[PDB]
Design a protein around this nucleic acid. Structure first.
Lengths: 137, 113, 56, 96, 78
RNA sequence: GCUGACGACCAUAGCACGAUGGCACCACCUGAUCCCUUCCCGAACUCAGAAGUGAAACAUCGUCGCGCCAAUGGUAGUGUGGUUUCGACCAUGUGAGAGUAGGUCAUCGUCAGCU
RNA sequence: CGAAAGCUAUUUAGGUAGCGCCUCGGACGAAUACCAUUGGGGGUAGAGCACUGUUUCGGCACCGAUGCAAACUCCGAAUACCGAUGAGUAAUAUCCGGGAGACACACGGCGGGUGCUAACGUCCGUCGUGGAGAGGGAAACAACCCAGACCGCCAGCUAAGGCCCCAAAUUCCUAGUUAAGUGGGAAACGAGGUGGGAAGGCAUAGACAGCUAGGAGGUUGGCUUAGAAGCAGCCAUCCUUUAAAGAAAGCGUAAUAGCUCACUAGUCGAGUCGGCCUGCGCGGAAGAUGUAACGG
RNA sequence: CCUCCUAAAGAGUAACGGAGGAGUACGAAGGUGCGCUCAGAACGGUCGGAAAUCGUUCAUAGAGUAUAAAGGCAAAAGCG
RNA sequence: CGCUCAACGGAUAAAAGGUACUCUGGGGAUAACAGGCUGAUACCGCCCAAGAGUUCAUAUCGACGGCGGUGUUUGGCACC
């Protein structure tokens, strides 16, 4: 359950998600990269589940890099409460995702096993994903 | 230190530039003393007098008497150049000793400030 | 020299500036042709309302 | 280590003209450095993709033949689509 | 959860009042500001709230001058 | 040719490294009687002076090590009209930031002095 | 001729008053609007870590890579706003006075806060429409699109939208795609639908499929385990006979055993195999009066 | 009533929207003239340390500005 | 000079409650029932497969996660 240890402000605005992912579209740390073709919100629970499935598949044979962190807080309102009377608290944290953004990277493992693990992680995640080979340029 | 001396002269320099009057700036060294009159624009020298002048070059420079002389000659030069009302600029030097004698000579010899 | 300007489409529902541009051109109604001297100000007006005007 | 290019005219430059060119399946590129002024060219996207497949292409001396004049250059930068990944622009430097 | 913070202050209407190239007479307020976002050069005076106003007739000019690269407002006699 | 004062400009003018400069000028430097200084101290400031030195500082020269400046092209955004699957797209006008090639060890003004 | 549902204040919130908006009379006359050129300041969109934080990895708080932010900014537009000059067009702008009405607004875009980037939800800014507006289109449908009705004509041209019949106009022409009535509701995902595109692997030294024969020994590789023999799990994945055969890709056994597969040789003879991108299609797809998700 | 955001780069702009302060103080904490430059880090030094004061080297503000925040502040608006 | 006239443009120098014993003028400008919009929640279904199932993911069940349908619970709005 990734979460910032402390934050300057408890609550944050909803914001708008637009544009392509110009930064973070290139794989650096690891040879094997998984990218998101669709924009959306990535929850900490989603990140944890994908990490756990990838770790189980690798069985300590490869190194995993997480390029997504849920710094942004999300406020949700409780049931049987009228609209207004103040903003709700941060039930959960999400990471804004843009098309082409790096989610996970793998190194030190065979391509086929990495592809299978990335397939499992994609199945868990809400984003369409295409595996991309790392390119120098 | 010349750095500190310029640091403590800038207040008066800026206030005189705001006033927009001709400025009688002094600059004294252990050997020589110089006085010159700068235009309100701050980039034109219209009158000058130092102990490098031939009249008092081969003499007791770096002295209160030399400062008094330089004041008298720059006062005459300013009178001949048409300047009558200036703002004194000790240029960070304490208004005292050679600077004070220079200022008093200039003030008594035609210039009023 | 002079140029012929005609209003293809209605200007009632356009922005205030575009309506004033049509007034400056002199076109009060659709399929109305007017004569104006060819100069960059008039060309700028025709450019601003280009979509709803044509020039002969 | 050779590729064929075509002069990119001033009317093929800019945002809209660049998008039209990529719709006509040409990748814009600029050859600069060396001694002379920059030259704007277009490279067929399939040829450029095949050239980018090979790995020493990024570290050896390349030869651009612009329907005529010849240019020895080195690929300096490559702009790809953030999501699709296909090459969008090329930056080459003349080698002296 | 009640986080009671529904306060705000009234507007102050700060900003540039007369821009570059405009005719200006003595006493016109040019800039209303907090601190010296703009400084007073020749022809412009400075009030206790950092207001910049024209000391004489002329045309307002904006410039970046000095070592600190400060923004300056002047009134040129033109 | 160089030095000093006052300015223009405020890093392509800076930092860093190395070299040259003492006939003028500048700076150190000698002394604290006198003017004037220290919540103590001649450090600074101030006065009276040239025995000594360009050591430090200062000025000039050289470089690309840093800093700074910086294209062309492309991309992003964007006013107007239209379309839209609401992500965007088309026509037109505009056009960044970052990065790359590259540039830089400033350019001038008034006065005075030695040569 | 012609609004407003706005600001401010209010024992005020469905009232009232000042201002903004309408009308009439007078004064004034380009001082007003549009467009071209041009002088200005900005900190928004975007972008970025140089400050305030926050995040991952590696090296050793600091360095190098790597992301994020309404109350972060080393940067930074397009618009908009304030001015100047100059044409043309225009029933302009400003001031004084008489008379009001209005201070419940709504929907559709765009920039947002709130909400669940839910609501024909709620609050702002801004543009269009209705309000106060007919007409044609969207089947019916204030707010969407085209367009602003002075009256009359059994005249013509067009806008949006359409041209097989209801129902006015093409069973019009060219080139292709779909076989689902998709068109004419619905996603993750799945598949051997179909068309096209850029490249690949193999191939008459016989490519893919099919069929026949083999598919082995060290050896039950070592560890672990009650068992662990290619096939629970962990660490190797070496050698030999070879034409080839994996310390094994599956089924199977408590473990064996057993059946396959990869691979090789033989038969056959010509094209064949698997990835990527793009267009249109398929499943996923269940509700209550009656077809009833093209108006028919 | 004041500061920041919302607020869409002139001004203005709402929500029972997101965050904090005010209902004072000073005859000096005002005026003028003059003079001065902070926080930190490291090194050395009796008690004396992580950190007291003293000395040295860097240090455009990483300090201070009576007070909440924004802007500003070197001619300091900071300190005598 | 005297107001925490702080409901801060301050109604009087001077002021709390009950009503199911009640009553009048209005409102669907505004709530409870129902209908309407929405679908957070709820119900159902599907995707992945860690596992349980003596062995064995998929006979049967489906952790961490993801995507839909219904209007069908608890809700939101206040359109009749």
């Amino acid at each position: 359950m990734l979460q910032p240890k402390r934050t300057k402000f408890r609550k944050m605005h909803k914001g708008r998600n637009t544009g392509l992912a110009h930064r973070g579209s290139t794989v650096a740390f690891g040879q094997f990269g998984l990218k998101s073709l669709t924009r959306g919100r990535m929850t900490a629970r989603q990140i944890e589940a994908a990490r756990r499935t990838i770790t189980r598949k690798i069985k300590r044979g490869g190194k995993i890099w997480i390029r997504v962190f849920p710094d942004k807080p999300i406020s949700n309102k409780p049931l049987e409460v009228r609209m207004g009377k103040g903003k709700g608290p941060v039930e959960y944290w999400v990471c804004e995702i843009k098309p082409g953004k790096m989610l996970y990277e793998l190194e030190g493992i065979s391509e086929e096993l990495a592809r299978e693990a990335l397939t499992l992680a994609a199945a868990k995640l809400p984003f369409k994903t295409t595996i991309v080979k790392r390119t120098i340029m | 230190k010349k750095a500190a001396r310029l640091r403590r002269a800038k207040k008066t320099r800026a206030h005189i530039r705001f006033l927009g009057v001709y400025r009688l700036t002094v600059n004294r060294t252990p050997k020589h003393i110089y006085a010159q009159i700068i235009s309100p624009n701050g980039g034109e020298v219209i009158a000058q007098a130092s102990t490098l002048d031939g009249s008092l070059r081969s003499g007791a420079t770096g002295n209160a008497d030399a400062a008094t002389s330089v004041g008298q000659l720059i006062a005459e030069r300013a009178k001949a150049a048409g300047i009558t009302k200036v703002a004194f600029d000790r240029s960070g030097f304490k208004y005292h000793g050679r600077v004070k004698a220079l200022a008093e000579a200039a003030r008594e010899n035609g210039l009023e400030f | 020299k002079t140029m012929k300007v005609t209003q293809l489409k209605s200007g009632a529902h356009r922005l205030k500036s575009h309506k004033a541009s049509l007034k400056g051109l002199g076109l009060r109604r659709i399929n109305h042709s007017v004569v104006v001297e060819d100069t960059p100000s008039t060309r700028g007006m025709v450019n601003r309302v280009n979509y709803l005007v044509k020039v002969e | 280590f050779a590729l064929n290019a075509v002069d990119r005219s001033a009317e093929l430059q800019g945002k809209g003209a660049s998008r039209r060119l990529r719709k006509q399946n040409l990748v814009p590129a600029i050859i600069y450095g060396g001694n002379e002024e920059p030259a704007s060219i277009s490279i067929k996207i399939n040829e450029l993709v095949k050239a980018l497949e090979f790995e020493a292409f990024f570290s050896h001396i390349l030869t651009i033949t612009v329907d005529g004049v010849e240019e020895q250059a080195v690929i300096k930068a490559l702009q790809r689509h953030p999501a699709k990944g296909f090459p969008m622009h090329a930056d080459f430097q003349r080698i002296v | 959860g009640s986080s009671r913070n529904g306060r705000d202050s009234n507007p102050k209407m700060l900003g540039v009042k007369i821009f570059g190239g405009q005719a200006i007479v003595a006493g016109n307020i040019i800039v209303r500001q907090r601190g010296t976002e703009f400084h007073a050069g020749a022809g412009v005076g400075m009030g206790r709230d950092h207001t910049l106003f024209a000391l004489n007739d002329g045309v307002v000019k904006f410039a970046t001058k000095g070592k600190f690269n400060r923004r300056y407002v002047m009134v040129e006699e033109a």
